[PDB]
Design a protein around this ligand. Structure first.
Ligand code: HEM
Ligand SMILES: CC1(C)[C@@H]2CC[C@@]1(C)C(=O)C2
Length: 408
Protein backbone atom coordinates (compact mmCIF):
# COMPACT_ATOMS: atom_id res chain seq x y z
CA UNK A 1 0.00 0.00 0.00
CA UNK A 2 1.44 3.38 -1.01
CA UNK A 3 1.00 6.47 1.11
CA UNK A 4 -0.86 9.07 -0.90
CA UNK A 5 -1.76 12.71 -0.50
CA UNK A 6 -4.60 14.71 -2.16
CA UNK A 7 -3.50 17.21 -4.83
CA UNK A 8 -3.59 20.80 -3.57
CA UNK A 9 -6.11 23.24 -5.20
CA UNK A 10 -3.54 24.69 -7.68
CA UNK A 11 -2.58 21.25 -9.14
CA UNK A 12 -4.99 20.33 -12.00
CA UNK A 13 -5.91 16.65 -12.59
CA UNK A 14 -4.29 16.48 -16.01
CA UNK A 15 -0.77 17.02 -14.56
CA UNK A 16 -1.08 14.22 -11.98
CA UNK A 17 1.17 11.17 -12.53
CA UNK A 18 1.68 8.36 -10.02
CA UNK A 19 5.42 8.29 -9.73
CA UNK A 20 7.26 6.85 -6.73
CA UNK A 21 10.88 8.19 -6.68
CA UNK A 22 11.77 5.63 -3.97
CA UNK A 23 10.37 2.62 -5.85
CA UNK A 24 10.01 3.57 -9.52
CA UNK A 25 7.60 1.70 -11.75
CA UNK A 26 9.73 -0.62 -13.95
CA UNK A 27 12.76 -0.32 -11.68
CA UNK A 28 13.62 -4.04 -12.03
CA UNK A 29 14.74 -3.20 -15.62
CA UNK A 30 17.11 -0.53 -14.36
CA UNK A 31 17.15 2.88 -12.68
CA UNK A 32 17.75 4.80 -15.92
CA UNK A 33 15.16 2.83 -17.84
CA UNK A 34 12.58 3.36 -15.08
CA UNK A 35 13.12 7.15 -15.11
CA UNK A 36 12.91 7.05 -18.94
CA UNK A 37 9.38 5.60 -18.72
CA UNK A 38 8.29 8.92 -17.14
CA UNK A 39 9.73 10.93 -20.04
CA UNK A 40 7.26 10.10 -22.81
CA UNK A 41 6.87 12.15 -26.06
CA UNK A 42 3.78 14.07 -24.83
CA UNK A 43 4.42 14.28 -21.10
CA UNK A 44 4.09 17.71 -19.52
CA UNK A 45 7.35 19.44 -18.46
CA UNK A 46 6.15 19.38 -14.84
CA UNK A 47 3.99 16.60 -13.42
CA UNK A 48 2.73 16.15 -9.85
CA UNK A 49 2.78 12.83 -7.94
CA UNK A 50 0.53 12.10 -4.87
CA UNK A 51 3.32 9.87 -3.49
CA UNK A 52 6.19 10.71 -1.13
CA UNK A 53 4.23 13.58 0.47
CA UNK A 54 3.08 15.04 -2.87
CA UNK A 55 5.53 16.91 -5.12
CA UNK A 56 6.39 18.02 -8.63
CA UNK A 57 8.76 16.30 -10.97
CA UNK A 58 10.62 18.09 -13.78
CA UNK A 59 10.48 15.76 -16.77
CA UNK A 60 12.80 17.42 -19.28
CA UNK A 61 16.45 18.46 -19.18
CA UNK A 62 16.04 22.17 -19.88
CA UNK A 63 13.79 22.66 -16.84
CA UNK A 64 16.24 20.67 -14.73
CA UNK A 65 19.17 22.77 -15.95
CA UNK A 66 17.24 26.03 -15.46
CA UNK A 67 15.93 25.19 -11.99
CA UNK A 68 19.45 24.32 -10.72
CA UNK A 69 20.76 27.59 -12.17
CA UNK A 70 18.03 29.75 -10.54
CA UNK A 71 18.50 29.82 -6.73
CA UNK A 72 16.45 33.05 -6.42
CA UNK A 73 13.33 31.28 -7.74
CA UNK A 74 14.13 27.74 -6.55
CA UNK A 75 15.80 27.65 -3.19
CA UNK A 76 17.98 24.99 -1.58
CA UNK A 77 16.13 25.38 1.73
CA UNK A 78 14.54 21.97 0.98
CA UNK A 79 16.39 19.68 -1.43
CA UNK A 80 14.90 16.30 -0.45
CA UNK A 81 11.55 14.63 -0.69
CA UNK A 82 9.54 13.89 1.30
CA UNK A 83 9.35 17.41 2.77
CA UNK A 84 9.85 15.97 6.30
CA UNK A 85 13.22 14.54 5.26
CA UNK A 86 14.16 17.77 3.46
CA UNK A 87 13.39 19.74 6.61
CA UNK A 88 15.48 17.35 8.78
CA UNK A 89 18.43 17.56 6.33
CA UNK A 90 21.39 19.48 7.82
CA UNK A 91 24.41 19.45 5.48
CA UNK A 92 26.48 22.47 4.44
CA UNK A 93 26.57 24.34 2.12
CA UNK A 94 24.03 22.30 0.23
CA UNK A 95 21.17 23.69 2.42
CA UNK A 96 22.22 27.30 1.68
CA UNK A 97 21.55 29.78 -1.17
CA UNK A 98 23.94 32.56 -2.26
CA UNK A 99 25.22 34.64 -0.55
CA UNK A 100 25.49 32.40 2.59
CA UNK A 101 26.48 29.44 0.40
CA UNK A 102 29.47 31.10 -1.27
CA UNK A 103 32.12 31.36 1.50
CA UNK A 104 31.48 27.66 2.32
CA UNK A 105 31.79 26.65 -1.32
CA UNK A 106 35.05 28.66 -1.54
CA UNK A 107 36.30 26.77 1.53
CA UNK A 108 35.44 23.40 -0.09
CA UNK A 109 37.08 24.43 -3.39
CA UNK A 110 40.35 24.98 -1.50
CA UNK A 111 40.46 21.20 -0.96
CA UNK A 112 38.60 19.95 -4.04
CA UNK A 113 39.77 22.16 -6.94
CA UNK A 114 41.15 20.57 -10.10
CA UNK A 115 44.80 21.47 -9.31
CA UNK A 116 44.45 19.75 -5.86
CA UNK A 117 42.70 16.72 -7.33
CA UNK A 118 45.40 16.26 -10.01
CA UNK A 119 47.90 15.66 -7.20
CA UNK A 120 45.96 12.57 -6.06
CA UNK A 121 46.13 10.66 -9.33
CA UNK A 122 48.85 8.17 -8.44
CA UNK A 123 47.45 7.40 -4.94
CA UNK A 124 44.09 6.74 -6.59
CA UNK A 125 45.77 4.54 -9.22
CA UNK A 126 47.67 2.56 -6.58
CA UNK A 127 44.39 1.85 -4.75
CA UNK A 128 42.69 0.83 -8.02
CA UNK A 129 45.57 -1.50 -8.99
CA UNK A 130 45.69 -3.23 -5.60
CA UNK A 131 41.97 -4.06 -5.70
CA UNK A 132 41.93 -5.19 -9.36
CA UNK A 133 45.02 -7.40 -8.83
CA UNK A 134 43.12 -9.33 -6.15
CA UNK A 135 40.82 -10.81 -8.81
CA UNK A 136 42.17 -10.13 -12.31
CA UNK A 137 43.73 -13.61 -12.69
CA UNK A 138 40.54 -15.22 -11.37
CA UNK A 139 38.26 -14.69 -14.39
CA UNK A 140 35.28 -13.52 -12.33
CA UNK A 141 34.18 -11.19 -9.54
CA UNK A 142 31.02 -9.70 -8.14
CA UNK A 143 31.84 -6.15 -9.25
CA UNK A 144 29.66 -4.40 -6.63
CA UNK A 145 30.98 -5.90 -3.40
CA UNK A 146 34.52 -6.54 -4.73
CA UNK A 147 35.17 -3.23 -6.55
CA UNK A 148 32.53 -0.47 -6.81
CA UNK A 149 31.81 -0.36 -3.06
CA UNK A 150 35.55 -0.70 -2.24
CA UNK A 151 37.54 1.58 -4.59
CA UNK A 152 35.83 5.00 -4.09
CA UNK A 153 35.50 4.44 -0.32
CA UNK A 154 39.20 3.61 0.12
CA UNK A 155 40.08 6.61 -2.02
CA UNK A 156 37.91 9.00 -0.05
CA UNK A 157 38.69 7.76 3.48
CA UNK A 158 42.45 8.04 2.67
CA UNK A 159 42.04 11.56 1.31
CA UNK A 160 39.97 12.52 4.36
CA UNK A 161 42.55 10.93 6.73
CA UNK A 162 40.03 8.47 8.17
CA UNK A 163 40.39 4.76 8.98
CA UNK A 164 39.13 2.39 6.30
CA UNK A 165 37.39 0.33 9.01
CA UNK A 166 34.78 3.12 9.32
CA UNK A 167 33.51 2.31 5.79
CA UNK A 168 30.62 0.08 6.94
CA UNK A 169 29.15 2.41 9.55
CA UNK A 170 29.44 5.44 7.23
CA UNK A 171 27.85 3.45 4.37
CA UNK A 172 24.89 2.59 6.62
CA UNK A 173 24.32 6.29 7.50
CA UNK A 174 24.68 7.23 3.81
CA UNK A 175 21.94 4.72 2.84
CA UNK A 176 19.50 6.19 5.32
CA UNK A 177 20.30 9.72 4.05
CA UNK A 178 19.76 9.04 0.34
CA UNK A 179 17.36 6.08 0.48
CA UNK A 180 15.61 6.58 3.87
CA UNK A 181 13.54 3.70 5.29
CA UNK A 182 9.83 4.13 5.90
CA UNK A 183 6.55 3.87 4.07
CA UNK A 184 5.24 7.25 5.20
CA UNK A 185 6.57 10.83 4.76
CA UNK A 186 7.01 11.06 8.54
CA UNK A 187 8.83 7.71 8.79
CA UNK A 188 11.29 8.74 6.06
CA UNK A 189 11.73 12.09 7.78
CA UNK A 190 12.61 10.21 10.98
CA UNK A 191 15.07 7.85 9.21
CA UNK A 192 16.91 10.76 7.57
CA UNK A 193 16.96 12.63 10.90
CA UNK A 194 18.58 9.61 12.60
CA UNK A 195 21.14 9.23 9.78
CA UNK A 196 22.00 12.94 9.85
CA UNK A 197 22.52 12.78 13.66
CA UNK A 198 24.79 9.71 13.17
CA UNK A 199 26.96 11.76 10.78
CA UNK A 200 27.14 14.65 13.30
CA UNK A 201 28.14 12.25 16.11
CA UNK A 202 30.90 10.79 13.95
CA UNK A 203 32.16 14.09 12.66
CA UNK A 204 32.20 16.13 15.94
CA UNK A 205 35.45 14.66 17.42
CA UNK A 206 37.20 15.07 14.07
CA UNK A 207 36.29 18.76 13.90
CA UNK A 208 37.42 19.22 17.54
CA UNK A 209 40.71 17.44 16.86
CA UNK A 210 41.39 19.16 13.53
CA UNK A 211 40.47 22.83 14.19
CA UNK A 212 43.80 24.62 13.74
CA UNK A 213 45.37 21.18 13.28
CA UNK A 214 48.38 20.60 11.06
CA UNK A 215 47.24 17.43 9.29
CA UNK A 216 47.42 17.67 5.51
CA UNK A 217 44.22 15.60 5.01
CA UNK A 218 41.14 16.97 3.16
CA UNK A 219 39.15 17.66 6.30
CA UNK A 220 41.87 19.72 8.08
CA UNK A 221 42.47 21.72 4.87
CA UNK A 222 38.80 22.76 4.37
CA UNK A 223 37.75 23.12 8.04
CA UNK A 224 40.49 25.71 8.60
CA UNK A 225 39.52 28.04 5.74
CA UNK A 226 38.21 31.23 7.36
CA UNK A 227 34.62 32.24 6.80
CA UNK A 228 34.22 36.05 6.77
CA UNK A 229 37.47 36.63 8.65
CA UNK A 230 36.76 34.02 11.33
CA UNK A 231 37.06 30.29 12.02
CA UNK A 232 34.01 28.45 10.63
CA UNK A 233 31.34 27.99 13.40
CA UNK A 234 30.69 24.58 15.01
CA UNK A 235 27.20 24.18 13.53
CA UNK A 236 28.40 24.77 9.98
CA UNK A 237 31.48 22.58 10.50
CA UNK A 238 29.25 19.62 11.46
CA UNK A 239 27.09 20.04 8.35
CA UNK A 240 30.10 20.60 6.09
CA UNK A 241 32.27 17.66 7.16
CA UNK A 242 29.18 15.40 7.11
CA UNK A 243 28.55 16.54 3.52
CA UNK A 244 32.15 15.82 2.49
CA UNK A 245 31.67 12.23 3.68
CA UNK A 246 28.22 11.76 2.15
CA UNK A 247 29.32 13.20 -1.22
CA UNK A 248 32.63 11.28 -1.15
CA UNK A 249 31.15 7.88 -0.34
CA UNK A 250 27.74 7.28 -1.91
CA UNK A 251 27.98 8.76 -5.39
CA UNK A 252 30.97 7.29 -7.28
CA UNK A 253 30.16 3.83 -5.81
CA UNK A 254 26.74 3.84 -7.44
CA UNK A 255 27.82 5.52 -10.66
CA UNK A 256 30.48 2.84 -11.19
CA UNK A 257 27.94 0.02 -10.89
CA UNK A 258 25.59 1.37 -13.55
CA UNK A 259 28.44 2.22 -15.88
CA UNK A 260 30.01 -1.22 -15.58
CA UNK A 261 26.77 -3.10 -16.20
CA UNK A 262 26.45 -1.21 -19.49
CA UNK A 263 30.10 -1.75 -20.47
CA UNK A 264 29.76 -5.51 -19.75
CA UNK A 265 26.92 -5.57 -22.28
CA UNK A 266 28.79 -3.45 -24.85
CA UNK A 267 32.10 -5.17 -25.78
CA UNK A 268 32.43 -3.02 -28.92
CA UNK A 269 32.47 0.11 -26.75
CA UNK A 270 35.01 -1.44 -24.33
CA UNK A 271 37.12 -2.41 -27.37
CA UNK A 272 37.08 1.21 -28.65
CA UNK A 273 38.39 2.41 -25.29
CA UNK A 274 41.21 -0.20 -25.59
CA UNK A 275 42.14 0.65 -29.16
CA UNK A 276 42.12 4.42 -28.50
CA UNK A 277 43.26 5.41 -24.95
CA UNK A 278 42.46 9.03 -25.73
CA UNK A 279 38.84 7.98 -26.60
CA UNK A 280 38.61 6.66 -23.04
CA UNK A 281 40.04 9.84 -21.44
CA UNK A 282 37.83 12.06 -23.63
CA UNK A 283 34.74 9.86 -23.30
CA UNK A 284 34.44 9.96 -19.50
CA UNK A 285 32.10 12.96 -19.63
CA UNK A 286 29.87 10.91 -21.95
CA UNK A 287 29.64 8.27 -19.20
CA UNK A 288 28.58 10.99 -16.72
CA UNK A 289 25.83 12.08 -19.17
CA UNK A 290 24.70 8.50 -19.44
CA UNK A 291 24.78 7.24 -15.85
CA UNK A 292 23.23 10.00 -13.71
CA UNK A 293 22.52 8.90 -10.15
CA UNK A 294 21.05 11.90 -8.26
CA UNK A 295 17.37 12.91 -8.07
CA UNK A 296 17.01 15.80 -5.62
CA UNK A 297 14.81 18.84 -5.20
CA UNK A 298 14.39 22.58 -4.91
CA UNK A 299 11.85 24.70 -3.02
CA UNK A 300 9.63 27.14 -4.96
CA UNK A 301 10.42 30.61 -3.56
CA UNK A 302 7.16 32.36 -4.57
CA UNK A 303 3.90 31.78 -6.40
CA UNK A 304 4.77 31.72 -10.10
CA UNK A 305 4.03 30.34 -13.53
CA UNK A 306 6.99 28.32 -14.84
CA UNK A 307 6.89 26.47 -18.18
CA UNK A 308 3.11 27.01 -18.40
CA UNK A 309 2.53 25.58 -14.93
CA UNK A 310 1.23 27.26 -11.79
CA UNK A 311 3.51 26.74 -8.79
CA UNK A 312 2.89 27.74 -5.16
CA UNK A 313 5.50 29.10 -2.79
CA UNK A 314 6.78 26.09 -0.82
CA UNK A 315 6.13 23.55 -3.58
CA UNK A 316 8.93 20.97 -3.97
CA UNK A 317 10.18 20.06 -7.43
CA UNK A 318 12.17 16.86 -7.81
CA UNK A 319 14.97 17.02 -10.37
CA UNK A 320 15.70 13.51 -11.70
CA UNK A 321 19.11 14.33 -13.21
CA UNK A 322 18.89 11.27 -15.49
CA UNK A 323 16.14 13.12 -17.41
CA UNK A 324 18.61 15.74 -18.54
CA UNK A 325 21.49 13.57 -19.92
CA UNK A 326 19.02 11.00 -21.29
CA UNK A 327 16.60 13.58 -22.67
CA UNK A 328 16.03 12.63 -26.33
CA UNK A 329 15.46 16.37 -26.98
CA UNK A 330 19.02 17.04 -25.85
CA UNK A 331 20.78 13.94 -27.22
CA UNK A 332 20.03 11.65 -30.11
CA UNK A 333 20.03 7.97 -29.18
CA UNK A 334 20.45 9.01 -25.52
CA UNK A 335 20.63 5.45 -24.09
CA UNK A 336 23.71 4.73 -26.23
CA UNK A 337 27.21 5.52 -25.03
CA UNK A 338 28.95 7.31 -27.90
CA UNK A 339 32.51 8.14 -26.88
CA UNK A 340 32.73 10.62 -29.81
CA UNK A 341 29.54 12.50 -28.84
CA UNK A 342 30.44 16.20 -29.29
CA UNK A 343 27.57 17.47 -27.15
CA UNK A 344 27.47 15.66 -23.75
CA UNK A 345 25.58 18.40 -21.83
CA UNK A 346 23.99 16.92 -18.69
CA UNK A 347 23.05 17.73 -15.09
CA UNK A 348 24.65 14.68 -13.53
CA UNK A 349 26.68 17.16 -11.43
CA UNK A 350 23.70 19.58 -11.37
CA UNK A 351 24.19 23.27 -12.37
CA UNK A 352 24.42 26.73 -10.82
CA UNK A 353 26.22 27.56 -7.56
CA UNK A 354 25.94 24.01 -6.14
CA UNK A 355 27.29 22.30 -9.27
CA UNK A 356 29.21 19.33 -7.80
CA UNK A 357 32.32 20.47 -5.90
CA UNK A 358 33.66 16.89 -6.18
CA UNK A 359 33.38 16.66 -9.98
CA UNK A 360 37.16 16.77 -10.58
CA UNK A 361 37.63 13.98 -8.06
CA UNK A 362 34.74 12.00 -9.64
CA UNK A 363 36.16 12.31 -13.18
CA UNK A 364 39.65 11.27 -12.05
CA UNK A 365 38.46 8.22 -10.03
CA UNK A 366 36.49 6.99 -13.07
CA UNK A 367 39.29 7.72 -15.58
CA UNK A 368 41.83 5.91 -13.40
CA UNK A 369 39.39 3.07 -12.72
CA UNK A 370 38.81 2.40 -16.43
CA UNK A 371 42.52 2.72 -17.31
CA UNK A 372 43.62 0.18 -14.69
CA UNK A 373 40.63 -2.09 -15.29
CA UNK A 374 41.18 -2.36 -19.06
CA UNK A 375 44.95 -2.80 -18.57
CA UNK A 376 44.34 -5.95 -16.50
CA UNK A 377 40.92 -7.14 -17.70
CA UNK A 378 40.61 -5.96 -21.36
CA UNK A 379 37.49 -8.05 -22.04
CA UNK A 380 34.53 -8.99 -19.85
CA UNK A 381 30.82 -9.70 -19.76
CA UNK A 382 27.92 -9.92 -17.33
CA UNK A 383 27.24 -13.44 -16.11
CA UNK A 384 24.65 -15.30 -18.19
CA UNK A 385 21.13 -14.60 -16.95
CA UNK A 386 22.39 -12.51 -13.99
CA UNK A 387 19.80 -10.01 -12.70
CA UNK A 388 21.23 -6.85 -11.08
CA UNK A 389 19.10 -5.50 -8.21
CA UNK A 390 18.20 -1.80 -8.48
CA UNK A 391 17.19 0.86 -5.94
CA UNK A 392 15.82 4.34 -6.52
CA UNK A 393 15.74 7.40 -4.24
CA UNK A 394 17.69 10.65 -3.92
CA UNK A 395 20.71 8.61 -4.97
CA UNK A 396 20.32 5.48 -7.12
CA UNK A 397 21.99 2.21 -6.16
CA UNK A 398 22.60 -1.16 -7.77
CA UNK A 399 23.97 -4.50 -6.59
CA UNK A 400 24.70 -7.96 -7.92
CA UNK A 401 27.02 -7.40 -10.85
CA UNK A 402 28.70 -10.77 -11.58
CA UNK A 403 31.39 -10.28 -14.25
CA UNK A 404 33.28 -12.99 -16.14
CA UNK A 405 36.31 -13.06 -18.41
CA UNK A 406 39.13 -15.19 -19.76
CA UNK A 407 42.25 -14.33 -17.63
CA UNK A 408 44.58 -12.50 -20.08
C1 HEM B 1 29.41 10.10 -9.35
C2 HEM B 1 29.91 11.21 -8.79
C3 HEM B 1 29.07 12.39 -8.24
C4 HEM B 1 27.87 12.83 -8.64
C5 HEM B 1 26.98 12.22 -9.76
C6 HEM B 1 27.55 13.97 -7.80
C7 HEM B 1 26.40 14.75 -7.85
C8 HEM B 1 26.25 15.95 -7.20
C9 HEM B 1 25.11 16.84 -7.35
C10 HEM B 1 23.91 16.57 -8.28
C11 HEM B 1 25.30 17.90 -6.55
C12 HEM B 1 24.35 19.11 -6.34
C13 HEM B 1 23.44 18.92 -5.12
C14 HEM B 1 22.38 20.00 -5.03
O1 HEM B 1 22.69 21.17 -4.70
O2 HEM B 1 21.18 19.73 -5.28
C15 HEM B 1 26.57 17.69 -5.85
C16 HEM B 1 27.11 18.56 -4.93
C17 HEM B 1 28.21 18.33 -4.14
N1 HEM B 1 29.07 17.25 -4.24
FE1 HEM B 1 28.99 15.81 -5.78
N2 HEM B 1 28.59 14.18 -6.91
C18 HEM B 1 29.52 13.21 -7.15
C19 HEM B 1 30.73 13.05 -6.51
C20 HEM B 1 31.17 13.80 -5.46
C21 HEM B 1 32.37 13.54 -4.69
C22 HEM B 1 33.38 12.38 -4.91
C23 HEM B 1 32.47 14.48 -3.76
C24 HEM B 1 33.60 14.60 -2.72
C25 HEM B 1 33.29 14.85 -1.44
C26 HEM B 1 31.34 15.37 -3.91
C27 HEM B 1 31.10 16.46 -3.14
C28 HEM B 1 30.08 17.35 -3.31
C29 HEM B 1 29.92 18.55 -2.51
C30 HEM B 1 30.82 19.00 -1.35
C31 HEM B 1 28.66 19.20 -3.07
C32 HEM B 1 28.00 20.50 -2.61
C33 HEM B 1 28.50 21.65 -3.48
C34 HEM B 1 27.81 22.95 -3.13
O3 HEM B 1 26.76 22.96 -2.44
O4 HEM B 1 28.32 24.00 -3.57
N3 HEM B 1 30.57 14.93 -4.96
N4 HEM B 1 27.13 16.50 -6.27
C1 LIG C 1 22.83 14.64 -3.69
C2 LIG C 1 24.31 14.53 -3.33
C3 LIG C 1 25.05 13.59 -4.28
C4 LIG C 1 24.99 15.89 -3.19
C5 LIG C 1 26.31 15.52 -2.47
C6 LIG C 1 25.99 14.25 -1.66
C7 LIG C 1 24.49 14.13 -1.87
C8 LIG C 1 23.78 12.86 -1.43
C9 LIG C 1 23.97 15.37 -1.19
O1 LIG C 1 23.39 15.40 0.09
C10 LIG C 1 24.18 16.56 -2.08
Amino acid sequence: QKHRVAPPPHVPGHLIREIDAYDLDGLEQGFHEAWKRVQQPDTPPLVWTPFTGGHWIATRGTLIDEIYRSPERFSSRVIWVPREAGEAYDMVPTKLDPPEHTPYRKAIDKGLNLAEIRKLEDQIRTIAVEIIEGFADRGHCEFGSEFSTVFPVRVFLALAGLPVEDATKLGLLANEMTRPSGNTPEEQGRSLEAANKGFFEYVAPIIAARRGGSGTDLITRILNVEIDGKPMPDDRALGLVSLLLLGGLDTVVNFLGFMMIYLSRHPETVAEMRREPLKLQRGVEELFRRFAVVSDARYVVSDMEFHGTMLKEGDLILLPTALHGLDDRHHDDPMTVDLSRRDVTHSTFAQGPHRCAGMHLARLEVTVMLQEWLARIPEFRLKDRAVPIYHSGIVAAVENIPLEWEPQ
